[PDB]
Amino acid sequence: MLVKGNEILLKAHKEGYGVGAFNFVNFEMLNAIFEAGNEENSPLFIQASEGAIKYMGIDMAVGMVKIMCERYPHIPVALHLDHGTTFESCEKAVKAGFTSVMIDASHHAFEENLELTSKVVKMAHNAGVSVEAELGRLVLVNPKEAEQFVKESQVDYLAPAIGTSQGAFKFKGEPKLDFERLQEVKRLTNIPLVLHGASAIPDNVRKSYLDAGGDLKGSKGVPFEFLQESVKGGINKVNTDTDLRIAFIAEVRKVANEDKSQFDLRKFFSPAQLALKNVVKERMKLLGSANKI
Amino acid sequence: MLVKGNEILLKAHKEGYGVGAFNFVNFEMLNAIFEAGNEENSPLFIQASEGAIKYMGIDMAVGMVKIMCERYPHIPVALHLDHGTTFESCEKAVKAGFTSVMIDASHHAFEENLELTSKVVKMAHNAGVSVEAELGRLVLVNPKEAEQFVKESQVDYLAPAIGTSQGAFKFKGEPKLDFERLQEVKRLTNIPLVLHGASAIPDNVRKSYLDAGGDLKGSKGVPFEFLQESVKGGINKVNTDTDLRIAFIAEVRKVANEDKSQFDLRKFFSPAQLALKNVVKERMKLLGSANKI
Ligand SMILES: O=C(COP(=O)(O)O)[C@@H](O)[C@H](O)[C@H](O)COP(=O)(O)O
Ligand SMILES: O=C(COP(=O)(O)O)[C@@H](O)[C@H](O)[C@H](O)COP(=O)(O)O
Ligand code: NA
Ligand code: NA
Ligand SMILES: [Zn+2]
Ligand SMILES: [Zn+2]
Ligand SMILES: [Zn+2]
Ligand SMILES: [Zn+2]
């Protein structure tokens, strides 16, 4: 069922596994994510960015997820506002029915980040909603700051900057993350931690995309082994979007290329859903949330 | 708000205009249709085929429409099962919350078509749901059969075969419809009538599809002038799907062609929604449902 984000992530925290947090922008993405969770017996974090909310309308974002939760009532599901940029945005999400909200104030100095995060936490906790915040920038997280930040804000989960970035072009050269910083943050905070920019761009997905005429010039994601290492270090929420988009659009491009007469939307989007679903299923197995319901 | 189909079509029948009945398979199609109705101040028939229902799930088909109706509460909307093939399918749609259902038994002889239609009508009317049926095959409709069929079945609206067919390839030669049969059916039945296979393939939609590399070899739709003549002859519900698909997919193909690095779904589907919306807006103006709220 639809539950507070902490319900899912406190379990992952105590049992030492990662829960993928999968972005969606429409029905096809959401359906494929849910079918993956059903097939792998995995809890689900479903997340929508501010741009996704603008595209769908917040009423449709929440409404579609509630329909899907009722279709699969045995699956723990949290609905999460990804990268909220203002208090008002987080408050709108709480009022619409999100069960987790993130406030990204990491571009501010410690004191202002803490102040704004604490304001969001007070509002969200009063409504029974869990909160994510972010600390560090690509300087990276100061683990002693993270300790005090969590103690004072009462935030439920923290995204500490350890070297990732969003999108398909994460590393100019070889992938590298600061796992020692991660472990120190985990030791001092003892809460669930969040990894942003965690797409892997797997080889099969990249190939599917390029074969269909797409270009991913110099793309590089987080290797599978780094994702496993981050879970071993205490990451419990693993934000994943780019991998889903590439796998989905590769199949759309393929249909467009191979039948110029095809205009049935379902003939484009059924194979796209399948490819997205498979990415999610594999990721749930990799992160350790499979068979955890 | 969401209303019985007959509420919308009795008005169209009395006032002599046509209401487009627009198919959808996902959120993007549905959103564009509703924005068109909002912008043209037009009532909406929103329809889902059995295949569309399988693709979305009936819970999502109804649920998304209910969200959209709440977003635009001033627009009269009927939610219609298009081309139900069995009593049980129509019954499932009634139970899920559809406000209009169609049973297509036109491939049976008169007596069996009438029997099955009557069974659907009894079930749907008991639940406050309107019913569409079909008579004739591309032998065309016998107006005297239509008279008896409507009287005995109590069906709310009838689709009489006058020469259309579904899809992009409607006429091997010149477009021809039997407007005399139409007028006789209307005179004898005095109920709202339905035109199936009513896409026009407008020149600008065809051009966009071809400019993006698509193939529509041999395609031919119902001319705008024939749609207007049909309305003058008593057509009140105008089933439209192909035009929407072509306009939408033309823009998807265009985005794929012009940026091989693009994999944000919203960048494909925002222009696709706009093109679909514009087809619907123009069609609402052509059929006379604009400014009828
Ligand atoms: O960390 C993220 C995903 O990382 P990724 O790019 O998949 O490695 C998400 O939380 C992003 O913030 C989200 O994908 C941004 O979405 P939009 O703002 O483009 O909708
Ligand atoms: O008459 C119709 C549309 O006509 P069109 O092809 O747009 O001229 C609809 O009622 C069709 O029955 C519907 O488009 C079929 O949809 P699917 O069965 O392919 O979903
Ligand atoms: Na987030
Ligand atoms: Na119909
Ligand atoms: Zn950030
Ligand atoms: Zn971030
Ligand atoms: Zn038919
Ligand atoms: Zn038909």
Phi, psi of B221 (to 5 degrees): -105, -175
- Secondary element (H or E) of residue B101: strand B100-103
Q: Are B120 and B101 in contact, with CB atoms under 8 Å apart? A: yes
Q: Extract the tokens encoding A43.
A: 């809890």
Cβ atoms < 10 Å from Cβ of A147: 16
Q: Which of A106, A126, A125 is nearest to A116 (CA)?
A: A106
Q: Extract the tokens encoding B51.
A: 């295949």
Q: Extract the tokens encoding B18.
A: 């046509």
Q: Extract the tokens encoding A132.
A: 């994510």
Question: How far apart are alpha carbons B115 and B121 in whole angstroms?
Answer: 10
Tell me which amino acid residue B117 is: T
Q: Which residues contact A95 (CB under 8 A, 6 or more apart)?
A: A127
CA distance A23 to chain B (A): 12
Buried b (16+ CB within 10 A) or exposed e, A58-69: bebbbbbbbbbb
Q: Are B21 and B242 in contact, with CB atoms under 8 Å apart? A: no
- Secondary element (H or E) of residue B131: strand B130-135
A203 exposure class (CB count in 10 Å sphere: 0-12, 13-18, 19+): exposed
Whether residue B259 lies in the annotated active site = no
Buried b (16+ CB within 10 A) or exposed e, A205-217: bbebbbebebebe
Q: Which of B28, B18, B75 is nearest to B198 (CA)?
A: B18
Q: Which residues contact B293 (CB under 8 A, 6 or more apart)?
A: B41, B42, B43, B74, B75, B76
Selecting from B51, B246, B265 the residue whose C-beta is nearest the C-beta of A249 gives B265
Tell me which amino acid residue B235 is: I
Tell me which amino acid residue B222 is: V
| Residue pointed to by tokens 């966009």 | B208
Question: How far apart are alpha carbons A77 and A7 in whole angstroms?
Answer: 9
Q: Which of A234, A164, A242 is nearest to A206 (CA)?
A: A242
Look at chain A and report how many structural domains it folds into: 1
Question: How far apart are alpha carbons A277 and A26 in whole angstroms?
Answer: 14
Method: X-ray
Q: Are A239 and A287 in contact, with CB atoms under 8 Å apart? A: no
Question: How far apart are alpha carbons A291 and A232 in whole angstroms?
Answer: 18
Question: How far apart are alpha carbons B47 and B88 in whole angstroms?
Answer: 18
Q: Extract the tokens encoding B173.
A: 């030669």
Question: How far apart are alpha carbons A105 and A116 in whole angstroms?
Answer: 7
DSSP state of B220: B
Q: Extract the tokens encoding A88.
A: 């008002």
Whether residues A216 and B59 touch (CB distance < 8 A) is answered with: no
Q: What count of Cα atoms within 13 Å lies in the side-chain half-sphere of residue A92?
A: 15
* Coil, strand or helix at A109: coil
Partner residues linked to B22 by β-bridges? B46, B240
**Hey, of B64, B249, B274, which one would you mutate to test binding to chain A, going by the most A CBs within 10 A of its CB?**
B249
Q: Which residues contact B135 (CB under 8 A, 6 or more apart)?
A: B106, B113, B141, B142, B145, B146, B149, B158, B159, B160, B161
**Orientation angle between helical segments A203-211 and A265-287, nearest 10 degrees:** 160
Question: How far apart are alpha carbons A205 and A199 in whole angstroms?
Answer: 11
Question: How far apart are alpha carbons A74 and B158 in whole angstroms?
Answer: 44
Partner residues linked to B220 by β-bridges? B169
Question: How far apart are alpha carbons A122 and A187 in whole angstroms?
Answer: 25
E strand residue ranges, chain A = 19-23, 44-49, 77-84, 100-103, 130-135, 157-160, 193-195, 235-240
Q: Extract the tokens encoding A69.
A: 């939760």
**Hey, of A38, A62, A67, A258, which one would you mutate to test binding to chain B, going by the most B CBs within 10 A of its CB?**
A67
Question: What Cα–Cα distance (Å) separates residue B100 from each residue in A32, A186, B2, B160, B217?
Answer: 30, 57, 11, 18, 35
Rg (CA), chain A: 18
Q: Which atom of ligand 2 is nearest to the CA of B243?
A: 7
Tell me which amino acid residue A88 is: E
Whether residues B256 and A261 touch (CB distance < 8 A) is answered with: no
Tell me which amino acid residue A142 is: N
Partner residues linked to B25 by β-bridges? none
Question: What Cα–Cα distance (Å) separates residue B193 from each residue in A180, A189, B33, B143, B187?
Answer: 73, 69, 22, 12, 11
Q: Are B103 and B82 in contact, with CB atoms under 8 Å apart? A: no
Question: How far apart are alpha carbons A183 and B272 in whole angstroms?
Answer: 46
Q: Extract the tokens encoding A260.
A: 């110029």
Question: How far apart are alpha carbons A239 and A102 in whole angstroms?
Answer: 12
Chain mean position to CA A140: 20
Partner residues linked to A101 by β-bridges? A81, A131
Question: What Cα–Cα distance (Å) separates residue A142 from each residue in A127, A145, A147, A170, A236?
Answer: 30, 5, 9, 21, 19
Question: How far apart are alpha carbons B242 and A263 in whole angstroms?
Answer: 8
Testing ligand 2's pocket by substitution, the residue of B24, B45, B47, B49 carrying the most ligand atoms inside 8 A of its CB is B49
Ligand 4 centroid distance, CA of A127 (Å): 45
Question: How far apart are alpha carbons B76 and B21 in whole angstroms?
Answer: 13
* Coil, strand or helix at A77: strand
Whether residues B261 and A214 touch (CB distance < 8 A) is answered with: yes
Q: Which of B247, B222, B240, B203 is nearest to A265 (CA)?
A: B247
First and final CA of chain A: distance in angstroms? Answer: 11
Alpha helices in chain B (DSSP H): 5-15, 27-40, 50-56, 58-71, 87-96, 110-126, 143-153, 179-189, 203-211, 224-232, 242-258, 265-287
Q: Are A118 and A154 in contact, with CB atoms under 8 Å apart? A: yes
DSSP state of A134: E
DSSP state of A165: -
| Residue pointed to by tokens 């990732």 | A164
* Coil, strand or helix at B82: strand
**Orientation angle between helical segments A27-40 and A242-258, nearest 10 degrees:** 110
Q: Extract the tokens encoding B260.
A: 């091989």
Cβ atoms < 10 Å from Cβ of B112: 11
Partner residues linked to B130 by β-bridges? B100
| Residue pointed to by tokens 């399918």 | B89
Ligand 1 centroid distance, CA of A22 (Å): 9
B73 exposure class (CB count in 10 Å sphere: 0-12, 13-18, 19+): exposed
Question: How far apart are alpha carbons B154 and A233 in whole angstroms?
Answer: 69
State the Cα angle at A243 between A33 and A47, rounded to 5°.
Answer: 45
**Hey, of B253, B254, B276, which one would you mutate to test binding to chain A, going by the most A CBs within 10 A of its CB?**
B253
Please tell me chain A's helix, strand, coil percentages from 3-state DSSP, rounded to the nearest 5.
50, 15, 30
A43 exposure class (CB count in 10 Å sphere: 0-12, 13-18, 19+): buried
Partner residues linked to B255 by β-bridges? none
Which residues of chain B does A246 touch, with a Cβ-Cβ cutoff of 8 Å?
Answer: 263
Q: What count of Cα atoms within 13 Å lies in the side-chain half-sphere of residue B239?
A: 24
Q: Extract the tokens encoding B169.
A: 């390839």
Cβ atoms < 10 Å from Cβ of B278: 17
State the Cα angle at A288 between A284 and A293, rounded to 5°.
Answer: 80
Q: Extract the tokens encoding B222.
A: 């119902």
DSSP state of A81: E
DSSP state of A135: E
* Coil, strand or helix at A101: strand
| Residue pointed to by tokens 């990799």 | A286
Whether residues A27 and B56 touch (CB distance < 8 A) is answered with: yes
> Phi/psi class of residue B120: alpha, beta or left (left: φ > 0; alpha: ψ in -120 to 50)?
alpha
Range of the domain at B145: 1-293
DSSP string covering B227-262, please? HHHHHHTTEEEEEE-HHHHHHHHHHHHHHHHH-TT-
Q: Extract the tokens encoding B227.
A: 């749609």
Question: How far apart are alpha carbons A238 and A45 in whole angstroms?
Answer: 9
Q: Extract the tokens encoding B146.
A: 């239509």
Q: Which residues contact B175 (CB under 8 A, 6 or more apart)?
A: B220, B222, B223, B226
Q: Which atom of ligand 2 is nearest to the CA of B23?
A: 14
| Residue pointed to by tokens 């069922």 | A1
Q: Which residues contact A193 (CB under 8 A, 6 or more apart)?
A: A157, A158, A159, A160, A182, A185, A186, A234, A235, A236, A237
Question: What Cα–Cα distance (Å) separates residue A46 from each residue in A239, B33, B41, B142?
Answer: 10, 27, 35, 55
Q: What is the CATH number of the domain that holds A153?
A: 3.20.20.70
Question: How far apart are alpha carbons A40 and A52 in whole angstroms?
Answer: 26
Interface of A with B (CB under 8 A): 25-29, 31, 51-52, 55-57, 59-60, 63-64, 66-68, 70-71, 209, 213-217, 242, 245-246, 248-250, 252-253, 256, 260-266, 268-270
Q: In the structure, which protein residues have their CB atom closer than 6 angstroms to any atom of ligand 2?
A: B 23, 49, 51-52, 82-83, 166-167, 196-199, 239-242
Q: Which residues contact A79 (CB under 8 A, 6 or more apart)?
A: A2, A46, A47, A48, A61, A62, A65, A97, A98, A99, A100
Ligand 3 centroid distance, CA of B195 (Å): 49
Q: Extract the tokens encoding A98.
A: 């999100």
Tell me which amino acid residue B24 is: F
Question: How far apart are alpha carbons A20 and A239 in whole angstroms?
Answer: 6
Ligand found nearest the CA of A84: 3
Question: How far apart are alpha carbons B10 and B5 in whole angstroms?
Answer: 9
DSSP state of B25: S
